[PDB]
Enzyme design. Structure first.
Site, mmCIF file in Angstrom:
data_model
loop_
_atom_site.group_PDB
_atom_site.id
_atom_site.type_symbol
_atom_site.label_atom_id
_atom_site.label_comp_id
_atom_site.label_asym_id
_atom_site.label_seq_id
_atom_site.Cartn_x
_atom_site.Cartn_y
_atom_site.Cartn_z
ATOM 1 N N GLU C 706 72.546 73.162 28.125
ATOM 2 C CA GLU C 706 72.123 74.277 27.263
ATOM 3 C C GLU C 706 72.132 75.695 27.837
ATOM 4 O O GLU C 706 71.121 76.396 27.783
ATOM 5 C CB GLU C 706 70.744 73.969 26.663
ATOM 6 N N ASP C 707 73.271 76.083 28.412
ATOM 7 C CA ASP C 707 73.474 77.415 28.989
ATOM 8 C C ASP C 707 72.702 77.679 30.277
ATOM 9 O O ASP C 707 72.553 78.821 30.691
ATOM 10 C CB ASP C 707 73.204 78.523 27.959
ATOM 11 N N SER C 708 72.205 76.621 30.901
ATOM 12 C CA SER C 708 71.520 76.725 32.183
ATOM 13 C C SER C 708 72.519 76.277 33.236
ATOM 14 O O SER C 708 73.298 75.380 32.977
ATOM 15 C CB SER C 708 70.282 75.830 32.196
#
Ligand SMILES: [Zn+2]
Ligand SMILES: [Zn+2]
Ligand SMILES: [Zn+2]
Ligand SMILES: [Zn+2]
Lengths: 113, 64, 1079, 56, 57, 113
Positions: C706-708
């Site tokens: 998730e975009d991490s």
């Protein structure tokens, strides 16, 4: 057409009837001046225009680079370097036909069919 | 901002190669090859110097 | 060739530089303008003459008047302004005007390389900013719909008015009145249609007819002479009929000027020479011309009102101007000088028979520029806030952007219009709130300055220009009319030659390259604009000078030739400045080459008058650094366009000598592996904004979800993405006209006690700390007191800490002790800090592994970063993947990688070059799971990509509170983590809980965990009167005289106040513990 | 997505209803740990190549 | 309602003056001013009352 | 804007300055990790707690009343991979088949044929 007003007190010309002789007269309501009617037409409405499509086309309309080039051939000089567009009448109900003009005559021939 | 002792990516030293590099440029007019000869194979350690922006030079022109 | 136009561009910035506009517009105010302004409506019931503007000075007590310099004023928080003197006639000091760094009155303007290095001024600093009270203030461009132009708007079915035309007028030079002319048109496109116009001071509106007779033309046909230029246009004429009848009641000039309520008629004249269309000129004997105008307007009107011409494009940028710095200092000044005018009037109205405190012109200017409130000061906030902000210094490209920024006062304006092409960057613009109302200028764009009208007015009325005065619409059929700055200076017959002569005169340079000339053949008209505030770009000239076929005027001789500035490149007719208006009637060719078989891989490509220098010049700072923005979803580019203004790096080199609050420097910078040819002019190579991380787009621990992103600890230790953090607390020793001074010491005891919590032991006897000291918790950074001995010493913010890096004491003009302290701190990337590439691919750290745990490739090579493949499909940003590839080649090949926009490079091409070196043609490599050593069933997109470490690190956000400092008015907690505050539990948070039916818990929030308070109501008059002396039991509650029936309740103190307020508004909220109304 | 998504028939929707809140809440942790582990070893990625169409 | 609210009481005769906690002062520790917005327009009202009376005598 | 925008979770103290939340509960709040911050509130009574576990517990929230369907599924990596892992072509040997059952806390303790 180029209709007229009137000298003396330069105003709009309103029409009146020549009773005893049965015919139309025009006049003024500022003085008294009266000249006969130029034409029997007084007012027109037109709800489905067609006038202004030819919109000002000075001969110089061939130096404006933002215009398209068509290789057709005018109804007179029979050349092959013509420019065009659509009506300039910004009316949501107008149509989309192309009118073409030739720099060596100035006709208004279409492409329609 | 000076050269980074050891490359982030793999770890291989890269402190010494500085003067060596800036020379093999001025004279020998190389890049790719110089590096290759400097023993800098894989892009990982490679990018460190070729991407280094020696700011320190302008800073050194400052007084204290 | 393509690579050539670059040299042309190079030639440009070598001479003009990114901030031309700013300086140029400033100097224009200093040099010229400022004079013309003071000499207009001066003389008072005693004249004024030339004005003197000396250089920077510092009148401080304990010294004479030290000639002050920029780099000092910054540190000592002063004002880079100088004196202004004027020889008044019936020598004098009058206000301090803040100079603009790097301009003309700034000494730097001459000093050369070594010379500057000696002035401590960083060469890379392009200057262009002001230095008020320390911080660098940058004036922001203010857009505004231009004036003196013809428009036409249709007004909705529900309205007594059909259509309307407006025209904003203001004297291009002289006061500049802001009164607009409104020529309405009641009666919708149906109902049985009058025509009225609005004049300044006139209650109702007036019907056009009277306005003609009121001018000096009473008879018809001499009137239609002016209106219609074709007696055979019956349509237009018809409409007018009902209107003539309206004014038919006024048959002369007497009543005409009358009806506007001998005294008024006399006054009538006035309202024609000072109110009626005030621009053009207010002289006398020019009545005639305006009549032809007022005719041309009502014409333009109907031309639309008859569905022949569309409604004027409200957001057609060409009809919008931009009041830069120079212009602003005018409309502001007048408001002041006019109060100055009537101020010197007050001194003379006290003299029952020097004095002029030239600080009101100094402090007035300051107020605005400091805050952002133009319009004076006083009880007059009715100005505009936004103008002038606190220049960004997060990164170099951040600061840059900020100066090149434009604003736009308030669903249609926010749109990205066509007209924005070339002049403004499409991507860079703030998210949310005002978005599109804040535009940044492109690279090639520039603003006008103000040329002269006459040298072209003459040049006209001396080449075929038969004056407007005597015109005959039928005798002169196709007379080509010409307009000058929104004024009609007569017509002209055949213009074709007259035209291509002035424009050639300009190309040699005898009539400024800045003027605009637009010919609208399709209407037979000539627009002439000299104006100050017109955005323009440059283009190549084509000209058919080939008597042997059909070709660009420029040659490879002009190129290699690049006493030859950019001014000559224009003085030779090789480039022209085409504004948005003139654009309308030209045809621009994209690629110079081509526009004068193929590979099934490359991108499919689809009379000429001008060519585009290069498409990649329509971008501003933000997008200019993005590699292949033509491969990402456009809205993404728009994101990076903002995030860029928030990354870390190095924002200047003098940084080691700046005492500014907040500042970050990236430990080890790194110029990108892939670049734009334009970067070469953004000195980016000498001031990078990030580092090249060895990316690896794959799934692993599931912490890159998730975009991490996952960051390789091992190299984080090797100093990867570490950054210094500065801060600068400053203090003074305040006084009073009543000799009572403060102190800078190491206070203790002494009858007062008023001191802080932390420790002072780390304070040497000078009341300061040392640069070695390891500060923490709350430790007092500075030591101050106020004898009235109460401590006023500054303590390091409870959440912060680090190490002192440089302390310094200094005098003040008021001979006070000025002292600034700077604290440094190294910030290491942590499992939470935010990062991002140049493709809107922002993400934070989820975890950090080392070399072993990390996945690797046979070669040995291991990644520094691992982002998730899921952040690609809907983000659509593909260039990222490409930036990676390219950069994976330049790494292995040692050659610098060009990423510049539309060139002749493809993924298929690059792929072959990578196959020549040894590795997979697509990048991909085999990897073995760092835990087991076993290969990965799949392959990974392993390749070096540039990564910026944006600020917003956890430890600057992490906040937790449990009963801390309470607010005063409310008594609830306080705002912000900095003041140890508490999070709001707003509506939406309430709601949810109520849905859950968490009755009690909610009751426990709002009371126990915040407000709460025990109030005593009265059993009779339900009020908070009771005098509850918690001892002698005494309760009482006079006025209703009770002491027996009283109740106790638990309500939020916040509410108690609400009631007191309500009470104080005379409303009576009775509280009953028992129902009385029954049912 | 169709079989383990926020859909009607959803395997989740059924385990809550058939077994209860607790067990299903736990069910996640299991299904997770298991998948992530497998992927951890099997690997997975994406790159430009996954976006090119055949020569013809 | 003759008891809780009669039409007449919509006009004020004696003005209810609210206390500190309503319109608090915000001192820069103690020996420094800091006065509320309202802590101005009260004396302004007061003055507009005083002067009024001093025009009615 | 959801009933699920606030839910009671079990506390697990861990190192490093950040709130560590489960993946599957991302879409209810509709959050991501591109910088997003989260507010946390701490209960205070003995009953408050019960009220938090009896009405705000995550398991009770699994089924959203608005569309009589869940509101938390398997996202990104876990979803994407489970598909692969499921395919007939996906085979696993003892060595890994062991480390996988071990990883399941709930394992009945019986190796399937
Ligand atoms: Zn007449
Ligand atoms: Zn012809
Ligand atoms: Zn390496
Ligand atoms: Zn009472």
């Amino acid at each position: 057409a180029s209709f007229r007003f009137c000298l003396e007190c330069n105003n709009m010309l309103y029409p009146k009837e020549d009773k005893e002789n049965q015919r139309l007269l025009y006049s003024c309501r500022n003085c008294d001046y009266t000249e006969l009617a130029e034409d029997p037409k007084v007012y027109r409405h037109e709800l489905i225009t067609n006038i202004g499509e030819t919109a000002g086309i000075v001969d110089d309309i061939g130096q404006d680079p933002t215009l398209p080039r068509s290789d057709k051939e005018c109804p007179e000089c029979h050349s092959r370097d013509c420019v065009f567009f659509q009506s300039q009448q910004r009316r949501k109900d107008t149509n989309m036909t192309l009118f073409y003009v030739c720099l060596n005559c100035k006709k208004t021939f279409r492409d329609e069919s | 901002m000076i050269i980074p002792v050891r490359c982030f990516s793999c770890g291989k030293v890269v402190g010494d190669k500085w003067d060596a590099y800036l020379r093999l440029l001025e004279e020998g007019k190389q890049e790719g090859d110089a590096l290759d000869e400097l023993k800098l194979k894989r892009y990982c350690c490679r990018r460190m110097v070729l991407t280094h922006v020696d700011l320190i030079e302008k800073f050194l022109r400052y007084n204290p | 060739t393509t690579e050539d136009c670059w040299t042309v561009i190079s030639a440009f910035f070598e001479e003009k530089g990114l901030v031309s506009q700013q300086l140029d517009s400033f100097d224009e105010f200093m040099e010229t303008s400022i004079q013309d302004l003071v000499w207009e409506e001066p003389r008072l019931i005693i004249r004024f003459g030339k004005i003197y503007l000396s250089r920077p000075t510092m009148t401080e007590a304990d010294g004479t008047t030290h000639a002050m310099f920029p780099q000092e004023a910054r540190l000592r928080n002063l004002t880079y302004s100088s004196p202004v003197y004027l020889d008044m006639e019936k020598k004098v000091h009058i206000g301090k005007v803040p100079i603009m760094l790097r301009s003309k009155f700034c000494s730097l303007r001459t000093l050369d390389e070594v010379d500057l290095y000696k002035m401590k001024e960083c060469p890379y600093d392009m200057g262009g900013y002001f230095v008020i009270n320390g911080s660098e203030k940058v004036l922001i461009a203010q857009e505004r719909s231009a004036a003196n132009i013809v428009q036409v708007f249709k007004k909705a079915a529900p309205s007594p008015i059909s259509h309307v035309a407006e025209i904003r007028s203001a004297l291009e030079k002289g006061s500049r009145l802001i009164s607009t002319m409104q020529i309405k048109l009641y009666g919708r496109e149906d109902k049985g249609r009058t025509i009225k116009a609005t004049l300044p001071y006139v209650k109702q509106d007036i019907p056009i007819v009277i306005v003609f007779r009121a001018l000096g033309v009473v008879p018809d046909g001499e009137i239609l002479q002016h209106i219609c230029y074709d007696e055979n246009d019956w349509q237009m004429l018809e409409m007018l009929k009902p209107c003539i009848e309206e004014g038919f009641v006024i048959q002369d000039k007497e009543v005409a000027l009358d009806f506007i309520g001998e005294k008024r008629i006399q006054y009538a004249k006035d309202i024609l020479q000072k109110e009626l269309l005030p621009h053009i000129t207010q002289e006398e004997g020019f009545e005639t011309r305006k009549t032809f105008f007022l005719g041309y307007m009502v014409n333009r009107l109907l031309l639309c009102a008859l569905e022949r011409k569309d409604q004027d494009d409200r957001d057609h940028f060409g009809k919008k101007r931009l009041d830069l710095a120079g212009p602003l200092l005018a409309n502001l000044f007048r408001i002041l000088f006019r109060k100055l005018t009537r101020e010197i009037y007050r001194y003379m109205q006290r003299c029952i028979e020097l004095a002029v405190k030239s600080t009101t012109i100094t402090s007035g200017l300051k107020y605005s520029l400091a805050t952002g409130n133009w319009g004076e000061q006083k009880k007059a906030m009715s100005s505009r806030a936004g103008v002038s902000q606190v220049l960004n210094r997060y990164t170099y490209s951040s600061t840059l952007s900020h100066l090149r920024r434009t604003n736009t006062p308030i669903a249609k304006p926010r749109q990205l219009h066509n007209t924005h092409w070339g002049l403004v960057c499409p991507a860079e613009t703030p998210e949310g709130q005002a978005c599109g109302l804040v535009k940044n200028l492109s690279l090639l764009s520039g603003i006008s300055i103000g040329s002269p009208s006459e040298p072209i007015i003459n040049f006209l009325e001396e080449w075929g220009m038969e004056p407007l005065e005597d015109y005959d619409p039928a005798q002169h059929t196709k007379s080509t009319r010409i307009f000058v700055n929104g004024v009609w200076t007569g017509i002209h017959r055949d213009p074709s030659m007259l035209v291509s002569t002035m424009r050639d005169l300009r190309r040699s340079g005898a009539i400024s390259p800045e003027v605009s000339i637009i010919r609208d053949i399709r209407e037979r008209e000539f627009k002439i604009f000299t104006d100050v505030g017109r955005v323009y770009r440059p283009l190549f000239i084509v000209e058919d000078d080939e008597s042997k076929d059909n070709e660009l005027r420029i040659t490879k001789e002009h190129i290699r030739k690049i006493v030859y500035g950019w001014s000559s490149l224009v003085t030779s007719g090789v480039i022209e400045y085409v504004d948005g208006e003139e654009e309308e009637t030209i045809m621009i060719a994209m690629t110079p080459e081509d526009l004068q078989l193929n590979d099934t891989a490359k991108r499919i490509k689809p009379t000429f008058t001008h060519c585009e220098i290069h498409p990649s010049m329509i971008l501003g700072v933000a997008a200019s650094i993005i590699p292949f923005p033509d491969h990402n979803q456009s809205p993404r580019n728009t994101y990076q366009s903002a995030m860029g203004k928030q990354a870390m790096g190095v924002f200047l080199t003098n940084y080691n000598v700046r005492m500014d609050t907040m500042a970050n420097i990236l430990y080890y910078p790194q110029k990108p592996l892939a670049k734009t040819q334009a970067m070469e002019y953004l000195k980016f190579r000498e001031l990078p904004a990030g580092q090249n991380a060895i990316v690896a787009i794959a799934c692993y621990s599931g912490y890159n979800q998730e975009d991490s992103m996952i960051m390789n600890q091992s190299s984080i230790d090797r100093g990867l993405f570490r950054s210094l953090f500065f801060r600068s607390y400053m203090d003074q020793e305040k006084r009073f006209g009543i000799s009572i001074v403060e102190e800078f010491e190491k206070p203790t005891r002494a009858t007062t006690l008023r001191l802080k919590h932390g420790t002072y032991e780390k304070l040497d006897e000078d009341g300061l700390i040392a640069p070695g000291v390891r500060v923490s918790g709350d430790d007092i950074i500075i030591g101050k007191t106020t004898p009235i001995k109460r401590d006023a010493s500054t303590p390091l913010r409870s959440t912060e800490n680090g190490i002192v890096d440089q302390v310094l004491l200094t005098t003040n003009q008021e001979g006070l002790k000025f002292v600034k302290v700077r604290m440094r701190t190294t910030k290491v990337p942590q499992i939470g800090d935010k990062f991002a590439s140049r493709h809107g691919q922002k993400g934070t750290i989820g975890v950090t592994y080392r070399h072993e745990d990390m996945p690797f490739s046979a070669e040995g090579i291991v990644p520094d970063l691992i982002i998730n493949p899921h952040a690609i499909p809907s983000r659509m940003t593909v260039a990222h993947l490409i930036e990676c590839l390219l950069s994976k080649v330049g790494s292995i090949r040692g050659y610098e990688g060009d990423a510049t926009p539309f060139t002749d490079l493809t993924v298929d091409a690059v792929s072959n070059l990578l196959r020549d070196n040894g590795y997979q043609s697509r990048g991909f490599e085999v990897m073995y799971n760092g835990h087991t050593g076993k290969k990965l069933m799949a392959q990974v997109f392993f390749g070096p990509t540039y990564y910026q470490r944006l600020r917003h690190m956890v430890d600057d956000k992490i906040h937790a509170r449990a009963r801390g400092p309470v607010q005063v008015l409310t008594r609830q907690p306080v705002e912000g983590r900095s003041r140890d505050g508490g999070l709001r539990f707003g509506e939406m948070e309430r709601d949810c809980m109520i849905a859950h039916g968490a009755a009690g818990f909610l009751k426990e929030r709002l009371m126990e965990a915040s407000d709460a308070f025990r109030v005593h109501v009265c059993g009779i008059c339900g009020l908070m009167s009771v005098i509850a002396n918690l001892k002698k039991n005494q309760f009482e509650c006079r006025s209703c005289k009770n002491k027996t029936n009283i109740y106790q309740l638990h309500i939020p103190y916040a509410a108690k106040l609400l009631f007191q307020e309500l009470m104080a508004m005379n409303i009576a909220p009775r509280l009953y513990t028992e129902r009385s109304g029954v049912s | 997505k169709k079989t383990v998504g926020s859909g009607g028939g959803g395997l989740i929707h059924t385990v809550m209803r058939e077994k209860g809140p607790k067990i299903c809440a736990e069910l996640f942790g299991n299904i997770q740990k298991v998948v992530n582990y497998w992927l951890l070893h099997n690997g997975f990625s994406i790159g430009i190549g996954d976006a090119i169409a055949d020569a013809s | 309602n003759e008891d809780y609210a009669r039409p007449e009481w919509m006009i004020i005769t004696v003005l209810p003056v609210p206390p500190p906690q309503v319109r608090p002062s915000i001192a820069m520790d103690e020996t420094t001013q800091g006065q509320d917005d309202l802590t101005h327009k009260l004396s302004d009202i007061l003055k507009a009352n005083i002067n009024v009376q001093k025009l009615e005598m | 804007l959801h009933k699920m925008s606030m839910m009671a979770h079990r506390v697990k103290v861990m190192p490093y300055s950040t709130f560590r939340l489960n993946l599957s509960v991302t879409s209810p709040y509709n959050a991501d990790f591109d910088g997003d911050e989260m507010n946390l509130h701490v209960p205070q009574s003995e009953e408050t707690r019960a009220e938090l576990s009896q009405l705000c517990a995550v398991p009770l929230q699994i089924v959203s009343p608005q569309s009589n369907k869940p509101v938390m599924g398997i996202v990104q990596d876990t979803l994407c991979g489970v598909r692969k892992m499921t395919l007939r072509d996906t085979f696993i040997e003892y060595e890994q088949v062991m480390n996988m059952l071990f990883w399941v806390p709930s394992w009945d303790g019986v190796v399937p044929q």
